[PDB]
Design a protein around this ligand. Sequence first.
Ligand SMILES: Nc1ncnc2c1ncn2[C@@H]1O[C@H](COP(=O)(O)OP(=O)(O)NP(=O)(O)O)[C@@H](O)[C@H]1O
Ligand SMILES: Nc1ncnc2c1ncn2[C@@H]1O[C@H](COP(=O)(O)OP(=O)(O)NP(=O)(O)O)[C@@H](O)[C@H]1O
Ligand SMILES: COc1ccc(C[C@H](N)C(=O)O)cc1
Ligand SMILES: COc1ccc(C[C@H](N)C(=O)O)cc1
Ligand SMILES: [Mg+2]
Ligand SMILES: [Mg+2]
Ligand SMILES: [Mg+2]
Ligand SMILES: [Mg+2]
Lengths: 257, 257
Amino acid sequence: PALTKSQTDRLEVLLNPKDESGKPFRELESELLSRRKKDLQQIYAEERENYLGKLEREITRFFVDRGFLEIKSPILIPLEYIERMGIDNDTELSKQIFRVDKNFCLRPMLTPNLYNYLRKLDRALPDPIKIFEIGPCYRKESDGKEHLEEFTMLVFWQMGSGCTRENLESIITDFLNHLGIDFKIVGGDTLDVMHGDLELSSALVGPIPLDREWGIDKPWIGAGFGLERLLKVKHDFKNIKRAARSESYYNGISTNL
Amino acid sequence: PALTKSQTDRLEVLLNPKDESGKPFRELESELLSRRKKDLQQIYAEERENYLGKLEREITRFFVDRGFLEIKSPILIPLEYIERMGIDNDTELSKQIFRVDKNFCLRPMLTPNLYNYLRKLDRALPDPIKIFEIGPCYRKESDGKEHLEEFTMLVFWQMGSGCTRENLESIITDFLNHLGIDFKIVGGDTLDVMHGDLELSSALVGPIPLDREWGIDKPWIGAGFGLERLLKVKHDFKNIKRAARSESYYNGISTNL
Ligand SMILES: Nc1ncnc2c1ncn2[C@@H]1O[C@H](COP(=O)(O)OP(=O)(O)NP(=O)(O)O)[C@@H](O)[C@H]1O
Ligand SMILES: Nc1ncnc2c1ncn2[C@@H]1O[C@H](COP(=O)(O)OP(=O)(O)NP(=O)(O)O)[C@@H](O)[C@H]1O
Ligand SMILES: COc1ccc(C[C@H](N)C(=O)O)cc1
Ligand SMILES: COc1ccc(C[C@H](N)C(=O)O)cc1
Ligand SMILES: [Mg+2]
Ligand SMILES: [Mg+2]
Ligand SMILES: [Mg+2]
Ligand SMILES: [Mg+2]
């Protein structure tokens, strides 16, 4: 008989992107279970690194080496930062916020913390100011295929001298060629970094009117990238859930074996 | 005149642990501002690494090298995990949970996710199963000096063969000697790892009755460490806020300059 849709769903959980119709479900399942167990055994025997942790470390090295200061700022942030980012009821993002208690939320972006860092560090560091952060961000989402409610963002941000669209495109290009991820840049000045139909990043050239609220009055360039989206593309995952912080997948391998 | 308490508070913000009464406040402040700006300039010119990020990477290397699998699991977890951990109204922890929506919370510990990992991985990996995770945890706290509401925990956990108190003490000892942090181990079997009066870690030898709820029926050893507490001790910070994810301190240096 033909496989049921439920059975095909089960096999797809166990199917790996580079895996290469008369056998019963039971046999196809046993074969895939055996392969995935071996995949996990090989990781455990050899590298033992988590893809999301490893990518964070690789990205950190890239930016530290190119003169950007590594920031680790709060994940739980004041709700006032959302309003101050110009996120009112007119915008999509207002309905995407995870509130915590009466005064806090889970950050949906790194931007407000990093605005504060740029303003503070400008009192201490030589121009240009170059900073980056990688860490958890949270948004309520409808979509499942390219969106996670708990994801990981990289932002890099330069302020002062050399903040041109050309230099922004150069950093993006060097970065993605370093990772081995194909892309196209599609065009304050605003740029989208695409992999086919998937947005890997939004990038911007300042100044913009919002800067004044944060005490910023210098030119700047920066961009935000989703790490799970980078992993999805690099590893050819069909669904972004394979790249997420998860109890269901480890390095894109089902843990339900 | 004598410095006011407010003025002394201000200078203490700018004071560094290894910094070595007739000058006015204005002069003491200028001197300390100059020193802290230089400290930040030196970081920016040279290493550019954040202490919390760097410590996470150092700890990751230590455990990966000693055969532990690196886990990155969800930070936003089901509220049901709290109840299933035996955290009812009789316990301190029940009142410390940050709830999110109706069904979720910010994890106050890594334990429930890692219990699920141990059960799942036991179907795939050879005995013993050795895993670890480092990442954000959240607890409502009264205390300010040794507690943060947003902190970072390491848990390592071995299950199966070799799960003895001796092997647990050995891992802890090798780990803290590797980091260069002084400690005493004070004594399921339960151990506390102390630095003077400060608890760096709680460690346990299983089995315990709770294991059954999570589908675990093997011996185990493990321990949980606060990264900000390790940093506080290593860098001789008077207050743990200097070691936190923060907008107010960077590598223990005031950003309010
Ligand atoms: N829910 C999510 N899950 C995974 N990655 C995300 C999510 N939201 C944003 N990102 C990533 O973070 C980057 C910068 O965020 P931002 O520019 O605010 O995204 P966005 O405009 O909401 N993109 P999209 O929702 O795909 O139209 C995006 O380009 C994505 O790579
Ligand atoms: N609020 C906090 N801030 C910083 N570190 C913490 C916090 N809570 C726990 N830790 C660290 O995480 C480790 C393991 O957590 P756990 O054993 O649950 O702590 P605890 O028993 O609540 N300790 P304490 O609250 O100091 O009595 C502790 O030994 C600390 O190093
Ligand atoms: C500094 O430059 C940027 C920073 C972040 C982003 C992504 C998104 N607009 C956000 O604010 O998260 C885009 C550009
Ligand atoms: C696997 O062994 C341990 C794991 C975690 C801890 C700290 C605390 N009891 C907690 O559950 O977070 C102590 C031991
Ligand atoms: Mg979106
Ligand atoms: Mg965008
Ligand atoms: Mg406590
Ligand atoms: Mg304890």
